Amino acid sequence: LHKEPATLIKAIDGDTVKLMYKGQPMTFRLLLVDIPETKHPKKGVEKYGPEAAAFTKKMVENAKKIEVEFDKGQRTDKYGRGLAYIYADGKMVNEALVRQGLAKVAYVYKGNNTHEQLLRKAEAQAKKEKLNIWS
């Protein structure tokens, strides 16, 4: 797996951020996390939705270096979003959210599972600490 540099354009949700990647703007969906959304045709602002969104935003907004890491499976979803792990100054946003109890580990999409155990590890811990969604 290779980390590549990107530039923040805008944070959109807990699970989605818009980056400048290889010169072109592009939307990315965080791999392997299921996040309370502020979007939704229905349910919209769900429990921990604005908290996950605020966390993701602060994390990428305060970083001086954003890196994107694609996995070994399919690299975009049916809506055209890049499927990746996002790093803010060396620290993985995906893991951060799960460790803080602000997302759950999602079902593995299309062969994309290199960091699945690392995230499941983080999830059990947040669970054990009864954090946010696990309260």
Swiss-Prot record:
It is found in: Secreted. Residues 115-131 have a biased composition (Basic and acidic residues). Ca(2+) binds at residues 15, 34-35. The active site is at 29, 37, 81. Residues 115-135 are annotated as: Disordered. It comes from the Bacteria. Coiled coil: none annotated. Transmembrane segments: none annotated. This is Nuclease A. It comes from Staphylococcus aureus.
